[PDB]
Design a protein around this ligand. Structure first.
Ligand SMILES: O=c1[nH]c(=O)n([C@@H]2O[C@H](COP(=O)(O)O)[C@@H](O)[C@H]2O)cc1Br
Ligand SMILES: O=c1[nH]c(=O)n([C@@H]2O[C@H](COP(=O)(O)O)[C@@H](O)[C@H]2O)cc1Br
Lengths: 258, 258
Protein backbone atom coordinates (compact mmCIF):
# COMPACT_ATOMS: atom_id res chain seq x y z
CA UNK A 1 0.00 0.00 0.00
CA UNK A 2 1.16 3.52 -0.95
CA UNK A 3 0.40 5.88 -3.83
CA UNK A 4 1.76 4.40 -7.10
CA UNK A 5 2.61 6.48 -10.16
CA UNK A 6 0.54 6.28 -13.36
CA UNK A 7 3.40 4.39 -14.98
CA UNK A 8 3.56 1.76 -12.21
CA UNK A 9 -0.20 1.32 -12.11
CA UNK A 10 -0.02 0.63 -15.86
CA UNK A 11 1.96 -2.55 -15.10
CA UNK A 12 -0.19 -3.88 -12.23
CA UNK A 13 -1.02 -7.62 -12.59
CA UNK A 14 -4.80 -7.00 -12.57
CA UNK A 15 -4.62 -3.99 -14.91
CA UNK A 16 -6.94 -3.90 -17.93
CA UNK A 17 -5.28 -3.46 -21.36
CA UNK A 18 -7.15 -0.27 -22.14
CA UNK A 19 -6.38 1.23 -18.72
CA UNK A 20 -2.72 0.26 -19.04
CA UNK A 21 -2.47 1.90 -22.48
CA UNK A 22 -3.95 5.11 -21.03
CA UNK A 23 -1.80 5.20 -17.87
CA UNK A 24 1.34 4.72 -19.97
CA UNK A 25 0.63 7.65 -22.33
CA UNK A 26 -0.47 9.83 -19.38
CA UNK A 27 2.93 9.41 -17.76
CA UNK A 28 4.74 9.72 -21.10
CA UNK A 29 2.97 12.96 -22.06
CA UNK A 30 2.59 14.20 -18.48
CA UNK A 31 -1.12 14.78 -18.94
CA UNK A 32 -4.12 13.54 -16.99
CA UNK A 33 -6.43 15.90 -18.88
CA UNK A 34 -9.46 14.63 -20.82
CA UNK A 35 -10.88 17.17 -23.29
CA UNK A 36 -14.68 17.17 -23.61
CA UNK A 37 -15.23 17.97 -27.29
CA UNK A 38 -18.90 18.95 -27.28
CA UNK A 39 -19.23 20.34 -30.78
CA UNK A 40 -21.82 20.02 -33.57
CA UNK A 41 -19.49 19.74 -36.59
CA UNK A 42 -17.06 16.95 -37.43
CA UNK A 43 -14.42 19.32 -38.82
CA UNK A 44 -14.70 21.09 -35.48
CA UNK A 45 -14.26 17.83 -33.57
CA UNK A 46 -11.31 16.89 -35.80
CA UNK A 47 -9.74 20.36 -35.63
CA UNK A 48 -9.80 20.38 -31.81
CA UNK A 49 -8.52 16.79 -31.44
CA UNK A 50 -5.54 17.68 -33.61
CA UNK A 51 -4.71 21.02 -31.99
CA UNK A 52 -5.13 19.86 -28.37
CA UNK A 53 -4.15 16.23 -28.89
CA UNK A 54 -0.59 16.72 -27.53
CA UNK A 55 -2.02 18.24 -24.33
CA UNK A 56 -4.53 15.50 -23.54
CA UNK A 57 -4.62 11.86 -22.47
CA UNK A 58 -8.18 11.37 -23.70
CA UNK A 59 -10.91 12.96 -25.79
CA UNK A 60 -14.51 12.59 -24.67
CA UNK A 61 -17.23 12.65 -27.31
CA UNK A 62 -21.02 13.01 -27.63
CA UNK A 63 -21.26 11.64 -31.13
CA UNK A 64 -25.07 12.09 -31.08
CA UNK A 65 -24.68 15.87 -31.00
CA UNK A 66 -22.69 15.84 -34.25
CA UNK A 67 -24.83 16.99 -37.17
CA UNK A 68 -22.55 15.43 -39.80
CA UNK A 69 -21.39 12.22 -38.15
CA UNK A 70 -20.19 9.39 -40.38
CA UNK A 71 -17.99 6.39 -39.69
CA UNK A 72 -15.36 7.98 -41.91
CA UNK A 73 -15.12 10.80 -39.36
CA UNK A 74 -14.41 8.28 -36.62
CA UNK A 75 -11.75 6.72 -38.85
CA UNK A 76 -10.04 10.07 -39.16
CA UNK A 77 -10.43 10.72 -35.40
CA UNK A 78 -8.71 7.43 -34.57
CA UNK A 79 -5.82 8.42 -36.85
CA UNK A 80 -5.41 11.55 -34.72
CA UNK A 81 -5.72 9.49 -31.51
CA UNK A 82 -2.98 7.17 -32.73
CA UNK A 83 -0.79 10.09 -33.91
CA UNK A 84 -1.13 12.29 -30.84
CA UNK A 85 -1.57 9.32 -28.51
CA UNK A 86 -4.83 9.71 -26.58
CA UNK A 87 -7.86 7.48 -26.10
CA UNK A 88 -11.39 8.05 -27.33
CA UNK A 89 -14.17 8.12 -24.77
CA UNK A 90 -17.75 8.22 -26.05
CA UNK A 91 -19.83 9.60 -23.18
CA UNK A 92 -22.84 7.50 -24.24
CA UNK A 93 -24.26 6.72 -20.86
CA UNK A 94 -25.66 3.27 -21.32
CA UNK A 95 -28.49 3.06 -18.84
CA UNK A 96 -30.92 0.36 -19.93
CA UNK A 97 -31.48 -3.38 -19.65
CA UNK A 98 -28.61 -5.55 -20.91
CA UNK A 99 -30.47 -6.78 -23.97
CA UNK A 100 -31.01 -3.23 -25.25
CA UNK A 101 -27.54 -1.76 -24.47
CA UNK A 102 -25.45 -4.38 -26.31
CA UNK A 103 -27.41 -3.38 -29.42
CA UNK A 104 -26.96 0.35 -28.81
CA UNK A 105 -23.25 -0.31 -28.18
CA UNK A 106 -22.53 -2.40 -31.25
CA UNK A 107 -25.13 -1.49 -33.86
CA UNK A 108 -27.12 1.39 -35.27
CA UNK A 109 -25.64 4.34 -37.14
CA UNK A 110 -22.89 5.10 -34.57
CA UNK A 111 -21.46 1.59 -34.08
CA UNK A 112 -19.76 3.04 -31.01
CA UNK A 113 -17.85 -0.13 -30.06
CA UNK A 114 -16.07 0.01 -33.42
CA UNK A 115 -14.15 3.17 -32.44
CA UNK A 116 -14.62 3.94 -28.75
CA UNK A 117 -11.82 2.73 -26.48
CA UNK A 118 -14.07 3.65 -23.57
CA UNK A 119 -17.81 4.12 -22.92
CA UNK A 120 -19.53 4.73 -19.59
CA UNK A 121 -22.78 3.48 -18.12
CA UNK A 122 -25.15 4.29 -15.27
CA UNK A 123 -25.52 1.53 -12.70
CA UNK A 124 -29.19 2.22 -11.92
CA UNK A 125 -30.45 -0.72 -14.12
CA UNK A 126 -28.54 -3.33 -12.14
CA UNK A 127 -25.48 -5.25 -13.31
CA UNK A 128 -27.35 -6.46 -16.37
CA UNK A 129 -26.25 -3.23 -18.03
CA UNK A 130 -22.57 -4.22 -17.66
CA UNK A 131 -23.10 -7.85 -18.68
CA UNK A 132 -24.91 -6.76 -21.84
CA UNK A 133 -22.27 -4.26 -22.89
CA UNK A 134 -19.55 -6.80 -22.03
CA UNK A 135 -20.76 -9.24 -24.64
CA UNK A 136 -19.89 -6.56 -27.19
CA UNK A 137 -16.94 -4.91 -25.46
CA UNK A 138 -14.78 -7.91 -24.57
CA UNK A 139 -14.54 -9.28 -28.17
CA UNK A 140 -13.56 -5.78 -29.26
CA UNK A 141 -11.00 -5.36 -26.47
CA UNK A 142 -12.84 -2.33 -25.04
CA UNK A 143 -13.20 -0.86 -21.57
CA UNK A 144 -16.12 0.53 -19.58
CA UNK A 145 -16.52 3.29 -16.92
CA UNK A 146 -19.30 3.19 -14.33
CA UNK A 147 -20.91 6.44 -13.22
CA UNK A 148 -20.59 6.30 -9.42
CA UNK A 149 -21.16 10.01 -8.74
CA UNK A 150 -22.27 13.00 -10.81
CA UNK A 151 -21.31 16.69 -10.80
CA UNK A 152 -24.81 18.15 -11.22
CA UNK A 153 -26.89 19.71 -8.43
CA UNK A 154 -29.49 17.25 -7.17
CA UNK A 155 -27.50 14.15 -8.17
CA UNK A 156 -28.89 10.88 -6.79
CA UNK A 157 -25.62 9.02 -7.31
CA UNK A 158 -24.82 9.16 -3.58
CA UNK A 159 -24.36 6.85 -0.59
CA UNK A 160 -25.57 3.33 -1.29
CA UNK A 161 -25.95 4.20 -4.99
CA UNK A 162 -22.26 5.04 -5.16
CA UNK A 163 -21.35 1.88 -3.23
CA UNK A 164 -23.40 -0.24 -5.62
CA UNK A 165 -21.38 1.17 -8.51
CA UNK A 166 -18.10 0.22 -6.85
CA UNK A 167 -19.23 -3.36 -6.11
CA UNK A 168 -20.44 -3.69 -9.70
CA UNK A 169 -17.14 -2.47 -11.16
CA UNK A 170 -15.10 -4.72 -8.90
CA UNK A 171 -17.22 -7.71 -9.95
CA UNK A 172 -16.73 -7.05 -13.67
CA UNK A 173 -13.07 -6.01 -13.74
CA UNK A 174 -12.53 -7.85 -17.01
CA UNK A 175 -14.48 -5.01 -18.66
CA UNK A 176 -14.96 -2.12 -16.20
CA UNK A 177 -11.70 -0.15 -15.92
CA UNK A 178 -12.85 2.63 -13.65
CA UNK A 179 -15.30 5.32 -12.68
CA UNK A 180 -16.84 8.63 -13.51
CA UNK A 181 -16.88 10.25 -10.05
CA UNK A 182 -16.15 13.41 -8.09
CA UNK A 183 -13.47 11.75 -5.98
CA UNK A 184 -11.65 8.45 -5.45
CA UNK A 185 -14.34 5.85 -4.74
CA UNK A 186 -12.30 2.64 -4.93
CA UNK A 187 -9.11 1.79 -3.05
CA UNK A 188 -7.99 -0.58 -5.82
CA UNK A 189 -5.27 1.15 -7.92
CA UNK A 190 -6.28 -0.83 -11.01
CA UNK A 191 -9.34 1.41 -11.28
CA UNK A 192 -9.23 4.79 -13.00
CA UNK A 193 -11.08 7.82 -11.68
CA UNK A 194 -12.33 10.43 -14.18
CA UNK A 195 -13.89 13.67 -12.86
CA UNK A 196 -16.12 16.01 -14.94
CA UNK A 197 -17.50 19.34 -13.70
CA UNK A 198 -14.03 20.92 -13.51
CA UNK A 199 -12.86 24.54 -13.95
CA UNK A 200 -10.09 26.70 -12.48
CA UNK A 201 -12.63 29.13 -11.04
CA UNK A 202 -15.56 28.44 -8.72
CA UNK A 203 -19.01 28.37 -10.27
CA UNK A 204 -21.26 26.39 -12.59
CA UNK A 205 -23.95 26.90 -15.25
CA UNK A 206 -27.71 27.55 -14.97
CA UNK A 207 -28.71 23.99 -15.88
CA UNK A 208 -27.31 22.14 -12.87
CA UNK A 209 -23.57 21.88 -13.59
CA UNK A 210 -21.22 22.55 -10.66
CA UNK A 211 -17.46 23.12 -10.87
CA UNK A 212 -14.44 22.30 -8.73
CA UNK A 213 -10.80 23.02 -9.51
CA UNK A 214 -8.16 20.48 -10.66
CA UNK A 215 -6.23 20.77 -7.37
CA UNK A 216 -9.41 20.03 -5.42
CA UNK A 217 -10.46 17.09 -7.60
CA UNK A 218 -7.04 15.51 -8.21
CA UNK A 219 -5.19 16.69 -5.12
CA UNK A 220 -7.74 16.78 -2.32
CA UNK A 221 -10.25 14.25 -3.59
CA UNK A 222 -7.81 11.74 -5.10
CA UNK A 223 -9.30 11.43 -8.58
CA UNK A 224 -6.98 10.70 -11.55
CA UNK A 225 -8.21 12.52 -14.64
CA UNK A 226 -10.08 15.79 -15.06
CA UNK A 227 -12.70 16.14 -17.80
CA UNK A 228 -13.00 19.72 -19.06
CA UNK A 229 -15.23 21.10 -21.81
CA UNK A 230 -16.30 24.73 -21.66
CA UNK A 231 -13.37 25.59 -19.37
CA UNK A 232 -11.21 25.12 -22.45
CA UNK A 233 -13.54 25.43 -25.46
CA UNK A 234 -15.05 28.85 -24.65
CA UNK A 235 -11.64 30.33 -23.88
CA UNK A 236 -10.21 32.71 -26.49
CA UNK A 237 -6.98 30.69 -26.58
CA UNK A 238 -7.83 27.00 -26.47
CA UNK A 239 -4.28 25.64 -26.57
CA UNK A 240 -3.23 27.84 -23.66
CA UNK A 241 -6.34 26.81 -21.72
CA UNK A 242 -5.51 23.17 -22.38
CA UNK A 243 -1.95 23.54 -21.12
CA UNK A 244 -3.18 25.42 -18.04
CA UNK A 245 -5.57 22.61 -17.14
CA UNK A 246 -2.97 19.96 -18.01
CA UNK A 247 -0.30 21.51 -15.78
CA UNK A 248 -2.96 22.12 -13.14
CA UNK A 249 -4.07 18.48 -13.03
CA UNK A 250 -0.56 17.07 -13.41
CA UNK A 251 1.06 19.10 -10.64
CA UNK A 252 -1.81 18.13 -8.30
CA UNK A 253 -1.13 14.51 -9.21
CA UNK A 254 2.62 14.86 -8.54
CA UNK A 255 2.00 16.58 -5.18
CA UNK A 256 -0.26 13.80 -3.94
CA UNK A 257 2.33 11.27 -5.11
CA UNK A 258 5.26 12.58 -3.06
CA UNK B 1 -58.29 8.95 -6.33
CA UNK B 2 -61.35 6.95 -7.34
CA UNK B 3 -60.78 5.11 -10.65
CA UNK B 4 -61.41 7.25 -13.73
CA UNK B 5 -61.41 6.10 -17.34
CA UNK B 6 -58.90 7.35 -19.90
CA UNK B 7 -61.52 9.52 -21.61
CA UNK B 8 -62.20 11.34 -18.33
CA UNK B 9 -58.56 11.89 -17.38
CA UNK B 10 -57.97 13.36 -20.85
CA UNK B 11 -60.39 16.17 -19.83
CA UNK B 12 -58.64 16.77 -16.51
CA UNK B 13 -57.30 20.07 -15.07
CA UNK B 14 -53.55 20.26 -15.31
CA UNK B 15 -53.57 17.72 -18.10
CA UNK B 16 -50.75 18.30 -20.57
CA UNK B 17 -51.79 18.65 -24.25
CA UNK B 18 -49.90 15.49 -25.28
CA UNK B 19 -51.14 13.39 -22.34
CA UNK B 20 -54.63 14.62 -23.28
CA UNK B 21 -54.22 13.60 -26.93
CA UNK B 22 -52.89 10.18 -25.91
CA UNK B 23 -55.61 9.42 -23.36
CA UNK B 24 -58.29 10.41 -25.91
CA UNK B 25 -57.04 8.00 -28.58
CA UNK B 26 -56.61 5.26 -25.96
CA UNK B 27 -60.32 5.59 -25.07
CA UNK B 28 -61.31 5.87 -28.75
CA UNK B 29 -59.38 2.79 -29.95
CA UNK B 30 -59.66 0.80 -26.72
CA UNK B 31 -55.91 0.27 -26.35
CA UNK B 32 -53.40 1.02 -23.60
CA UNK B 33 -50.67 -0.96 -25.33
CA UNK B 34 -47.29 0.54 -26.28
CA UNK B 35 -45.28 -1.37 -28.91
CA UNK B 36 -41.52 -1.51 -28.28
CA UNK B 37 -40.41 -1.62 -31.93
CA UNK B 38 -36.91 -2.88 -31.26
CA UNK B 39 -35.75 -3.74 -34.79
CA UNK B 40 -32.71 -2.65 -36.79
CA UNK B 41 -34.33 -2.06 -40.18
CA UNK B 42 -36.38 1.00 -41.11
CA UNK B 43 -38.47 -1.16 -43.46
CA UNK B 44 -39.49 -3.51 -40.64
CA UNK B 45 -40.11 -0.60 -38.26
CA UNK B 46 -42.52 1.04 -40.70
CA UNK B 47 -44.30 -2.20 -41.61
CA UNK B 48 -44.94 -3.00 -37.94
CA UNK B 49 -46.17 0.56 -37.31
CA UNK B 50 -48.61 0.27 -40.19
CA UNK B 51 -50.00 -3.18 -39.40
CA UNK B 52 -50.03 -2.69 -35.62
CA UNK B 53 -50.92 1.01 -35.65
CA UNK B 54 -54.66 0.34 -35.08
CA UNK B 55 -53.82 -1.94 -32.12
CA UNK B 56 -51.54 0.50 -30.28
CA UNK B 57 -51.80 3.85 -28.48
CA UNK B 58 -48.05 4.40 -28.71
CA UNK B 59 -44.97 3.18 -30.61
CA UNK B 60 -41.65 3.18 -28.70
CA UNK B 61 -38.45 3.55 -30.68
CA UNK B 62 -34.73 3.15 -30.12
CA UNK B 63 -33.46 5.17 -33.14
CA UNK B 64 -29.84 4.49 -32.22
CA UNK B 65 -30.46 0.82 -33.02
CA UNK B 66 -31.81 1.50 -36.53
CA UNK B 67 -29.04 0.61 -39.00
CA UNK B 68 -30.59 2.74 -41.75
CA UNK B 69 -32.00 5.75 -39.90
CA UNK B 70 -32.81 8.95 -41.81
CA UNK B 71 -35.29 11.73 -41.08
CA UNK B 72 -37.34 10.56 -44.05
CA UNK B 73 -38.01 7.36 -42.12
CA UNK B 74 -39.32 9.34 -39.14
CA UNK B 75 -41.28 11.47 -41.59
CA UNK B 76 -43.09 8.35 -42.80
CA UNK B 77 -43.46 7.00 -39.26
CA UNK B 78 -45.18 10.28 -38.35
CA UNK B 79 -47.54 9.89 -41.29
CA UNK B 80 -48.46 6.47 -39.88
CA UNK B 81 -48.83 7.73 -36.31
CA UNK B 82 -51.24 10.40 -37.58
CA UNK B 83 -53.14 7.90 -39.74
CA UNK B 84 -53.66 5.14 -37.17
CA UNK B 85 -53.60 7.54 -34.24
CA UNK B 86 -50.74 6.65 -31.87
CA UNK B 87 -47.95 8.66 -30.19
CA UNK B 88 -44.24 8.18 -30.97
CA UNK B 89 -42.09 7.63 -27.88
CA UNK B 90 -38.29 7.58 -28.24
CA UNK B 91 -36.73 5.59 -25.41
CA UNK B 92 -33.62 7.80 -25.30
CA UNK B 93 -33.28 7.70 -21.51
CA UNK B 94 -31.59 11.11 -21.22
CA UNK B 95 -29.36 11.04 -18.11
CA UNK B 96 -26.75 13.83 -18.27
CA UNK B 97 -26.48 17.45 -17.12
CA UNK B 98 -28.97 19.89 -18.62
CA UNK B 99 -26.59 21.73 -20.96
CA UNK B 100 -25.85 18.36 -22.57
CA UNK B 101 -29.28 16.68 -22.79
CA UNK B 102 -30.75 19.75 -24.54
CA UNK B 103 -28.26 19.32 -27.37
CA UNK B 104 -28.81 15.54 -27.60
CA UNK B 105 -32.58 16.21 -27.63
CA UNK B 106 -32.48 18.91 -30.27
CA UNK B 107 -29.61 18.22 -32.60
CA UNK B 108 -27.26 15.55 -33.84
CA UNK B 109 -28.29 13.30 -36.70
CA UNK B 110 -31.47 12.17 -34.94
CA UNK B 111 -32.97 15.57 -34.11
CA UNK B 112 -35.24 13.63 -31.74
CA UNK B 113 -37.34 16.62 -30.65
CA UNK B 114 -38.54 17.16 -34.23
CA UNK B 115 -40.44 13.82 -34.46
CA UNK B 116 -40.77 12.42 -30.93
CA UNK B 117 -44.02 13.13 -29.11
CA UNK B 118 -42.49 11.79 -25.89
CA UNK B 119 -39.02 10.99 -24.53
CA UNK B 120 -37.90 9.76 -21.12
CA UNK B 121 -35.13 10.64 -18.69
CA UNK B 122 -33.36 9.17 -15.67
CA UNK B 123 -33.54 11.34 -12.56
CA UNK B 124 -30.08 10.49 -11.23
CA UNK B 125 -28.48 13.67 -12.64
CA UNK B 126 -30.96 15.84 -10.75
CA UNK B 127 -33.76 18.12 -11.97
CA UNK B 128 -31.30 19.78 -14.33
CA UNK B 129 -31.89 16.92 -16.77
CA UNK B 130 -35.57 17.94 -16.96
CA UNK B 131 -34.71 21.63 -17.30
CA UNK B 132 -32.46 21.19 -20.36
CA UNK B 133 -34.99 18.98 -22.14
CA UNK B 134 -37.76 21.43 -21.21
CA UNK B 135 -36.03 24.27 -23.08
CA UNK B 136 -36.34 22.26 -26.28
CA UNK B 137 -39.64 20.46 -25.69
CA UNK B 138 -41.98 23.08 -24.22
CA UNK B 139 -42.56 25.12 -27.41
CA UNK B 140 -43.08 21.97 -29.50
CA UNK B 141 -45.70 20.71 -27.04
CA UNK B 142 -43.62 17.62 -26.28
CA UNK B 143 -43.79 15.54 -23.11
CA UNK B 144 -41.33 13.79 -20.83
CA UNK B 145 -41.55 10.58 -18.83
CA UNK B 146 -39.36 10.18 -15.75
CA UNK B 147 -37.88 6.74 -15.08
CA UNK B 148 -39.04 6.17 -11.49
CA UNK B 149 -38.54 2.40 -11.47
CA UNK B 150 -36.93 -0.18 -13.73
CA UNK B 151 -37.89 -3.76 -14.66
CA UNK B 152 -34.44 -5.36 -14.41
CA UNK B 153 -32.87 -7.38 -11.58
CA UNK B 154 -30.70 -5.22 -9.35
CA UNK B 155 -32.40 -1.96 -10.31
CA UNK B 156 -31.38 0.93 -8.01
CA UNK B 157 -34.51 2.89 -8.91
CA UNK B 158 -36.19 2.23 -5.54
CA UNK B 159 -37.17 3.71 -2.18
CA UNK B 160 -36.02 7.31 -1.94
CA UNK B 161 -34.89 7.26 -5.58
CA UNK B 162 -38.41 6.54 -6.82
CA UNK B 163 -39.72 9.17 -4.37
CA UNK B 164 -37.30 11.70 -5.84
CA UNK B 165 -38.52 10.82 -9.34
CA UNK B 166 -42.11 11.58 -8.34
CA UNK B 167 -41.19 14.88 -6.64
CA UNK B 168 -39.39 16.03 -9.78
CA UNK B 169 -42.28 15.16 -12.12
CA UNK B 170 -44.69 17.01 -9.84
CA UNK B 171 -42.31 19.98 -9.78
CA UNK B 172 -42.15 20.19 -13.59
CA UNK B 173 -45.72 19.17 -14.49
CA UNK B 174 -45.52 21.73 -17.29
CA UNK B 175 -43.35 19.28 -19.28
CA UNK B 176 -43.28 15.99 -17.33
CA UNK B 177 -46.40 13.98 -18.22
CA UNK B 178 -45.77 10.70 -16.42
CA UNK B 179 -43.47 7.85 -15.45
CA UNK B 180 -41.78 4.65 -16.52
CA UNK B 181 -42.48 2.39 -13.54
CA UNK B 182 -43.53 -1.11 -12.53
CA UNK B 183 -46.67 0.24 -10.87
CA UNK B 184 -48.55 3.38 -9.86
CA UNK B 185 -46.13 5.71 -8.08
CA UNK B 186 -48.25 8.88 -8.10
CA UNK B 187 -51.88 9.32 -7.10
CA UNK B 188 -52.32 12.40 -9.29
CA UNK B 189 -54.56 11.24 -12.19
CA UNK B 190 -52.95 13.63 -14.65
CA UNK B 191 -49.77 11.53 -14.53
CA UNK B 192 -49.36 8.56 -16.88
CA UNK B 193 -47.75 5.27 -15.85
CA UNK B 194 -46.03 3.20 -18.55
CA UNK B 195 -44.68 -0.24 -17.67
CA UNK B 196 -41.99 -2.22 -19.57
CA UNK B 197 -40.98 -5.79 -18.69
CA UNK B 198 -44.30 -7.27 -19.72
CA UNK B 199 -45.27 -10.56 -21.31
CA UNK B 200 -48.31 -12.74 -20.75
CA UNK B 201 -46.01 -14.97 -18.68
CA UNK B 202 -43.95 -13.80 -15.74
CA UNK B 203 -40.33 -14.75 -16.59
CA UNK B 204 -37.26 -13.12 -18.03
CA UNK B 205 -34.16 -13.06 -20.27
CA UNK B 206 -30.50 -13.99 -19.72
CA UNK B 207 -29.54 -10.33 -19.25
CA UNK B 208 -31.54 -9.11 -16.26
CA UNK B 209 -34.99 -8.48 -17.73
CA UNK B 210 -37.96 -9.61 -15.63
CA UNK B 211 -41.55 -10.12 -16.86
CA UNK B 212 -45.02 -9.71 -15.38
CA UNK B 213 -48.43 -9.97 -17.02
CA UNK B 214 -50.75 -7.18 -18.24
CA UNK B 215 -53.28 -8.24 -15.60
CA UNK B 216 -50.63 -7.86 -12.88
CA UNK B 217 -49.14 -4.57 -14.02
CA UNK B 218 -52.32 -2.80 -15.12
CA UNK B 219 -54.89 -4.44 -12.87
CA UNK B 220 -53.08 -5.25 -9.61
CA UNK B 221 -50.29 -2.66 -9.75
CA UNK B 222 -52.36 0.20 -11.18
CA UNK B 223 -50.22 1.11 -14.17
CA UNK B 224 -51.85 2.65 -17.27
CA UNK B 225 -49.95 1.36 -20.29
CA UNK B 226 -47.91 -1.78 -20.97
CA UNK B 227 -44.69 -1.53 -22.99
CA UNK B 228 -44.20 -4.82 -24.83
CA UNK B 229 -41.26 -5.71 -27.02
CA UNK B 230 -40.18 -9.31 -27.56
CA UNK B 231 -43.53 -10.68 -26.37
CA UNK B 232 -44.88 -9.40 -29.71
CA UNK B 233 -41.82 -8.82 -31.90
CA UNK B 234 -40.63 -12.43 -31.62
CA UNK B 235 -44.03 -13.79 -32.64
CA UNK B 236 -44.57 -15.17 -36.16
CA UNK B 237 -47.68 -13.03 -36.53
CA UNK B 238 -47.03 -9.77 -34.70
CA UNK B 239 -50.47 -8.29 -35.37
CA UNK B 240 -52.25 -11.23 -33.71
CA UNK B 241 -49.71 -10.90 -30.89
CA UNK B 242 -50.39 -7.16 -30.54
CA UNK B 243 -54.13 -7.80 -30.49
CA UNK B 244 -53.61 -10.39 -27.79
CA UNK B 245 -51.68 -7.96 -25.59
CA UNK B 246 -54.17 -5.18 -26.37
CA UNK B 247 -57.20 -7.07 -25.05
CA UNK B 248 -55.22 -8.29 -22.05
CA UNK B 249 -54.18 -4.82 -20.94
CA UNK B 250 -57.52 -3.15 -21.78
CA UNK B 251 -59.54 -5.71 -19.81
CA UNK B 252 -57.08 -5.40 -16.92
CA UNK B 253 -57.87 -1.68 -17.03
CA UNK B 254 -61.66 -2.12 -17.32
CA UNK B 255 -61.47 -4.24 -14.17
CA UNK B 256 -60.04 -1.67 -11.76
CA UNK B 257 -62.18 1.02 -13.37
CA UNK B 258 -65.13 -0.87 -11.94
O1 LIG C 1 -21.68 13.73 -13.94
C1 LIG C 1 -21.33 14.07 -15.15
N1 LIG C 1 -20.98 15.39 -15.30
C2 LIG C 1 -20.58 15.89 -16.53
O2 LIG C 1 -20.27 17.15 -16.65
N2 LIG C 1 -20.52 14.99 -17.62
C3 LIG C 1 -20.07 15.39 -18.95
O3 LIG C 1 -18.77 16.06 -18.79
C4 LIG C 1 -18.74 17.17 -19.68
C5 LIG C 1 -18.43 18.44 -18.79
O4 LIG C 1 -18.45 19.64 -19.62
P1 LIG C 1 -18.21 21.14 -19.03
O5 LIG C 1 -18.43 22.04 -20.25
O6 LIG C 1 -16.83 21.19 -18.51
O7 LIG C 1 -19.26 21.43 -17.94
C6 LIG C 1 -20.09 17.21 -20.43
O8 LIG C 1 -20.00 16.66 -21.77
C7 LIG C 1 -20.99 16.34 -19.61
O9 LIG C 1 -22.03 15.70 -20.34
C8 LIG C 1 -20.88 13.71 -17.50
C9 LIG C 1 -21.29 13.21 -16.31
BR1 LIG C 1 -21.77 11.32 -16.38
O1 LIG D 1 -37.08 -0.36 -17.02
C1 LIG D 1 -37.14 -0.39 -18.31
N1 LIG D 1 -37.25 -1.66 -18.85
C2 LIG D 1 -37.33 -1.88 -20.21
O2 LIG D 1 -37.43 -3.09 -20.64
N2 LIG D 1 -37.29 -0.75 -21.08
C3 LIG D 1 -37.38 -0.92 -22.54
O3 LIG D 1 -38.62 -1.61 -22.79
C4 LIG D 1 -38.42 -2.51 -23.86
C5 LIG D 1 -38.89 -3.89 -23.35
O4 LIG D 1 -38.65 -4.87 -24.37
P1 LIG D 1 -39.00 -6.43 -24.10
O5 LIG D 1 -38.55 -7.09 -25.38
O6 LIG D 1 -40.46 -6.50 -23.86
O7 LIG D 1 -38.16 -6.92 -22.91
C6 LIG D 1 -36.97 -2.44 -24.33
O8 LIG D 1 -36.81 -1.63 -25.52
C7 LIG D 1 -36.29 -1.77 -23.20
O9 LIG D 1 -35.14 -1.06 -23.62
C8 LIG D 1 -37.17 0.54 -20.57
C9 LIG D 1 -37.08 0.76 -19.18
BR1 LIG D 1 -36.90 2.65 -18.60
Amino acid sequence: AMELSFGARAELPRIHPVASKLLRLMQKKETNLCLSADVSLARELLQLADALGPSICMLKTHVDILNDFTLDVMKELITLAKCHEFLIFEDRKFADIGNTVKKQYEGGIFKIASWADLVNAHVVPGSGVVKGLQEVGLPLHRGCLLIAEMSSTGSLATGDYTRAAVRMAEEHSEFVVGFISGSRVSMKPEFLHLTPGVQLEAGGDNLGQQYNSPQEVIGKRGSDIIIVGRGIISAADRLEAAEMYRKAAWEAYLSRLG
